[PDB]
Amino acid sequence: DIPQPIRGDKGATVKIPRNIERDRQNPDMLVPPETDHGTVSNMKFSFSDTHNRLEKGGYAREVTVRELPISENLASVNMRLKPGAIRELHWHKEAEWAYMIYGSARVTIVDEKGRSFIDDVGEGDLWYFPSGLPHSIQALEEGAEFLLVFDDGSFSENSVFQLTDWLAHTPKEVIAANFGVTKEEISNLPGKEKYIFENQLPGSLKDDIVEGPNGEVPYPFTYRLLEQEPIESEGGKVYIADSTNFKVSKTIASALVTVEPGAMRELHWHPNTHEWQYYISGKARMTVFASDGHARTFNYQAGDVGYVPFAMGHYVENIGDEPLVFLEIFKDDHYADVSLNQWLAMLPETFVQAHLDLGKDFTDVLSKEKHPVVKKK
Amino acid sequence: DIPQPIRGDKGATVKIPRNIERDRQNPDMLVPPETDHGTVSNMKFSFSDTHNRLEKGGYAREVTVRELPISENLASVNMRLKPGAIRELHWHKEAEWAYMIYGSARVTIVDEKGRSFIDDVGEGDLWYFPSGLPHSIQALEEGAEFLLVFDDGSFSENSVFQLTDWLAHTPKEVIAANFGVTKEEISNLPGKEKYIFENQLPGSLKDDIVEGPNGEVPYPFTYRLLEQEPIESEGGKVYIADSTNFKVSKTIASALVTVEPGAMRELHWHPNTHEWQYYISGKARMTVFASDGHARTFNYQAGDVGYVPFAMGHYVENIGDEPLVFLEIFKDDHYADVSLNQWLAMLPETFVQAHLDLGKDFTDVLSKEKHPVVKKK
Amino acid sequence: DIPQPIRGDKGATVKIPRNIERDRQNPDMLVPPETDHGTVSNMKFSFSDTHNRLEKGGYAREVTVRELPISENLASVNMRLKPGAIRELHWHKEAEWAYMIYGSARVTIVDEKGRSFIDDVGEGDLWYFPSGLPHSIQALEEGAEFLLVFDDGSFSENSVFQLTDWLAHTPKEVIAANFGVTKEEISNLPGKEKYIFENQLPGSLKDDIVEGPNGEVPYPFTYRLLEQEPIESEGGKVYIADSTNFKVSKTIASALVTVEPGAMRELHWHPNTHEWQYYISGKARMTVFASDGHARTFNYQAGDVGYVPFAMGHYVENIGDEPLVFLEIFKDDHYADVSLNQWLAMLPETFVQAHLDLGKDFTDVLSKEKHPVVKKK
Amino acid sequence: DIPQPIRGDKGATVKIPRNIERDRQNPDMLVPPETDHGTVSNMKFSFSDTHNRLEKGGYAREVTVRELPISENLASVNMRLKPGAIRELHWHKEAEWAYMIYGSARVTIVDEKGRSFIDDVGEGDLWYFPSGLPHSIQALEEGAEFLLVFDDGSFSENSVFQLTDWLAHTPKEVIAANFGVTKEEISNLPGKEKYIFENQLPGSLKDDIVEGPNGEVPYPFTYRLLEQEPIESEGGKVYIADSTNFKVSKTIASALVTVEPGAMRELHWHPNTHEWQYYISGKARMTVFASDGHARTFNYQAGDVGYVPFAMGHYVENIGDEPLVFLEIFKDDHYADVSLNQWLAMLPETFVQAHLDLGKDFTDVLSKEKHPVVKKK
Amino acid sequence: DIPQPIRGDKGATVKIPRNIERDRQNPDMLVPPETDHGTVSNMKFSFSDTHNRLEKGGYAREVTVRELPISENLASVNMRLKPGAIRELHWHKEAEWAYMIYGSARVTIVDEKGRSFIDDVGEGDLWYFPSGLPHSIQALEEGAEFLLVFDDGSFSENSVFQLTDWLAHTPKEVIAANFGVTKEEISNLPGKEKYIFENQLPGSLKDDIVEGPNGEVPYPFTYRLLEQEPIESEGGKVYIADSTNFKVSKTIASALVTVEPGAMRELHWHPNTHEWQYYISGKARMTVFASDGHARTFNYQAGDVGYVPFAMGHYVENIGDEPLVFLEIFKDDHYADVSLNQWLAMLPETFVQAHLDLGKDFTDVLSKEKHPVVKKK
Ligand SMILES: [Mn+2]
Ligand SMILES: [Mn+2]
Ligand SMILES: [Mn+2]
Ligand SMILES: [Mn+2]
Ligand SMILES: [Mn+2]
Ligand SMILES: [Mn+2]
Ligand SMILES: [Mn+2]
Ligand SMILES: [Mn+2]
Ligand SMILES: [Mn+2]
Ligand SMILES: [Mn+2]
């Protein structure tokens, strides 16, 4: 049945040709809360609304500042590899964070000391490659699909440094001299980058491990986020990974949040930096509060990127029947938040009472323990 | 049936939760043309993906640079008034262009010489209010729904100058002194802006006309675009309105394009400025060609804003069953384009032949007459 | 008696209408030193020349980059609370530093671990709230007046995040769900921010202290600057507070300087960052030396903000009859300066002699001990 | 013999490895005039110091803001075509100005009204293609070498819009539909841009001329600069071409200056805009005077680009044995200059005398007639 | 013999007046590698192409962002002092790094604690003065010539803070008061900066050392780079100095590289920051690879500054008969690089094989030990 932008006696029927399907996806936007007010930048964008780069062995599509101007510090790729397919050995200026949503893959990485690290990554695992270190991904028997996050919003999947593209653009004489071979011995180097290519499934991880004169890396570039004990509350759970626990992960701080139906990520903000969001599954609404009485509510579902500017107040409410599952990303060495609840709970009852024009009956429910996700009892 | 991002042996099935509805709306994006390549900014955005401001008597929602960063020079509002509802008397820095999609409305405007202009606007009509001149809209018995375009992408519907908001923020003594009345005589001024408000239907246009010491305005601020004889070709028609014919319309140049099914707005570019697009009805695809072999294809349908950076090559192909109807907007005193066809048609056969590695059989079909929209005979 | 901009045979009488009162306040500007030269940005601005925001229970006025463009990194509020008046619970992006000039007040603050800190602040005390942590001020029986400094010059007192303003702009359903109460139980929440409001005087500090599951904060957010032993010299004293001693105070470094009549803050610069100044009492002049022989002298008195760009040479001379008292603020984790005197004192006599075309009689007076404020013996 | 940076008792011998060849080319830079002073941006750059793009049939190298940051408004290409070689049909955002130094070539251009213009260009001729209009160059039996100037310093020869590159990046179906042919009929379109390619010499100009439904262009896009009577003075001559005489040339104003040995382009400035310079032959020095007593002298010879910021005082002195020949380019609809000489000549003798502390003997030589190039009698 | 920009059947003879001398210096630019492609910023600039500031006792010339826009973070001075000549006591915002190419000199520096450090510096030695600390240089009996690097590309040698220039622009009364002398006692202070001046040779270093109330500096501001054991490979050696070994050197990381004829600095990049280069002696070529298949080759020799943007792939090949010697500078607390060779050497043979379409015969030569400079055996 057709929704209309009408709230009480405000609003009216749409009379011109419209996108009913999207109107349906965005109820709190066709009909915002009465408490919404003023202008805020766009805080939502769908991967389905982006050009998809198709290759032999997979695909990559991106959400960058070119799509979502508010996110100047952070950009993202949704990438897919078919079984055995290789995302070509490459590097880039930006540091890279990743979450494996579907399947598994082997990654390689070499650090600035000539040490290589090679690991398999399963669903619910992260990896993090520091700025400038060369790496690669190769999916296993199930193939693989994942989210990449880069710590610069100007990033583009099409302007990364590929191994073969470097070679093809280096004088043969110089390549030959570099390795001490003849020109002929390298006559067959690719004349073009590969980016993503089909390849036979890799062997066992153990058969791949390369030891060297310089020894093991100090710290691993992969982390089993879902093997961690989550912060658990009534309405759901939160799995945090930042530099304090996922050691190499210096420029990216993360939390995977799961929200039961009827639950919600509570009212809070972040006193460190901006929040970048990706929605893995479910349906949500968020109101971002930007001060000076400016406030706007966005709807999100699977494949949607979201965003909360530094310190803006928000909440994430599950408005669907299925679990709501999303990521919280920050460009920072740690996760941090202030809970509205915990905050007031830690101040004198009467002081809070004087602020809210409410009484004991309200301050009584305040809780000093933090519960990031609560249920609608 | 479910679409997948697969083209020949490139691409793969989506394995993670997805937005199938949007995937369906964007076929040429889930599966771009093989000839697409490289990165281009986002050139498409839907009004359905924006917060809608609901008032008593209508609504307004906007697409600004905050949503579509590529469009720094141009922004847009989709506004709706219920019958008799008034968009409050107001002004702003930006010049304003408008197209009446549904219904009709009376507008008023006063110029820098103290001359007022008052007209009724029907479907297919435009108006254009020069930077800084105060105006208002009032819908008639059918109500009204229209598109507004402003010649600065930083524009926001929420930061316009409203009559009552000015007064409420002016010292009463000063207001009283200004008009030579007492404070009491204006005690009842609104304490708040109205923005949009319900009101009884207006009388006849003739009963409203105000004459003054300074006489008629030199030129009208409304234009009957659809009363013009269109440039007509096989596949459809083009109705142009720019400063050369719609005289006051100095900073905005416009064309309403209608494209029969199986037809297409031909291959061309614009040698003056950027193109801002709004899609009134139908389904389309456009490829924007950005040089250095960069090219990207976007899908559009009703409620969608589009965009082509200065001189980028494009075409607009109807890929639907119904007529395709859209606006072309420029920040310029005239419309202008170069037709690929007409271009080659006006050069030596053999010269063109030498360029395209084709022969007479191709140059023979070239046409020196411009046909902006052609059919698939 | 009327001052004129005449120096020897340079300058002339003012012949047009003028501001004699200001001319009097700015002697070294109507008549600069002969050694002044070239253009420098404006380095002085008076709080008396700003719009004052008046509320029930106090006032706030600000000096931001909008008033003093040279100060891009730092901005300031002069705030006043009547006895018992509360500056509403709030937070903001910027970190906040403070100096209590008159009276006293209770502050509260909660950190990112859900720990609250509550303290009373008297004259000559500082507080420092890290970016993003929620806080509040409540004046005691004497009321309170203080200076706030924020580590971004784009700061505005009117765009802070207020508790009640957040709530009023959050859907009631969501608020209710957040705390697990009914809509009715919060029906009486303020429909508007309070910002500053009248309230009964608070109880004892001890009765207010809130303990919690997470324990005491590691470090206090208040510092008794005047209880410290000052660096004392002949002409006056300097009380420094930076991250090395006021531990939480990571982004702001400070010094309160007192200068007897006939004394002066010596010739120096700062090799770390810019200097932001506030003048609490007295009359001063400063010459800022900007290299390339550019130099300009400014006059300052109570209520005046001043400023010295990174590494520019300066001095602060008391030119009044009463003590001169001012603050030195830096956006940095430590205070640091180079004394011209100490500098030359630590180099070979003859080397210095060769530089200044002076002799032993001059190098003899140089001192290796730093004396930040000297007297005119 | 080896030059050293020594002037009187200032300076010293170079003691580290050096570029003697360049030192020789830059005498007034190794050893500037005593009257030089302070910092000025770099005002000189050599085409020999740029990467040269080599193609089949010629080459192109550029000087852009990426090489010469002071020139933000203007950039340049030095292009070379072998006999019959075609610079591929193309267009771009920037307007283009040109001077034929060696040989000749046929150009084509189509305007926004579908009118084509086709002309042959010889040595000493200019052309000017307005922003966005498609064009091409084809050298004749002698081949051709010329200078291109573009009215944006961000221009790059590698990011122009090529005909074939557009087609190769347009869906075949869409191309086919555009022209009403089959896919097969265009199967043989180039899969890649050509940029510059070898081709047989063109026929007579008359055999190439294409008439059309829309008639002759209003004005020609080529101008015989050297067929004009030059402003002639003792030391040389000046050939000006701007919008007042070369009608289409709206955004570019030009002058070809020839300076006999012992002569010099007199002391002057330009009260409209910046000056961009190219040196065709000879050796010169220029001092640019930037006010605040800042002044710097540059040496120039064949292949060198130069530059004078808006209104900066300068002169161009021939310091070689051969004629000095260079271009003066402006981004403006007209050429204009103020002659120092003419200026003083038009003011009261005694007034000028009072300024320069000279007497009648000096004012007597002043001349009211402008002589842009004077000789050292 | 005359070089021409011809490669196989690409390119053509230059037909217009040209700079053959530079053409000769830039072989890989007149005739780039076939593998070069696309646009890159300018990465090369010669000190011989700059205005030289001549003083009594030496000279200074600079390469700043005003000459080389790509280098926004880093600028450089080539300075020369005659025996006993003093670069006047001064300070500046920027931190300063230095390499002594010819001769020796005494430097002085005072830190923020009033501690002075005084040392003699010989060929192959570095010094590093932290932002804002006052210093000076005085050459010994041989005179001195060195390279200075400053950690801001906007730096200008003409806008430094000089001791005497400060004094001359400070009111005499204030100077007198500062030191507690009379105006007369300082009547003879220079009325102008000195910048560089002639002076008698200094005594022994030991006679100059100044002790003070505050003791020795924690760490020395000079470092004997060439006394270190170099990383030595077949083709040459690398001497690294960064914050890990040259302790005070916090914002600048450095390496002196020497390359035998027939050798080359291997294929690598830097995963931390940009590379700024200075060429001390020899002839080289470098190709910088900028991704998206963009690549450009530059020629360098003595007196040339070079540059590699963050993470761009490069190599430095000696193309001369004499040793090639150059500096690598970074704005960072450590040196770091990734070797292409070492990188592939640390990954599974077959994985690498699958990337390069080569076989065992190639992976066999890969080496896990890093060899920064290799020879053409
Ligand atoms: Mn990557
Ligand atoms: Mn959050
Ligand atoms: Mn309007
Ligand atoms: Mn168009
Ligand atoms: Mn605050
Ligand atoms: Mn100071
Ligand atoms: Mn062109
Ligand atoms: Mn000129
Ligand atoms: Mn220095
Ligand atoms: Mn390197």
Curated annotation (Swiss-Prot), chains A, B, C, D, E:
SUPFAM superfamilies: RmlC-like cupins. Binds 2 manganese ions per subunit. This is Oxalate decarboxylase OxdC. Mn(2+) 1 binds at residues 90, 92, 96, 135. It is found in: Cytoplasm. Its EC number is 4.1.1.2. One of its GO terms (cellular component) is cytoplasm. Pfam families: Cupin_1. It comes from Bacillus subtilis (strain 168).
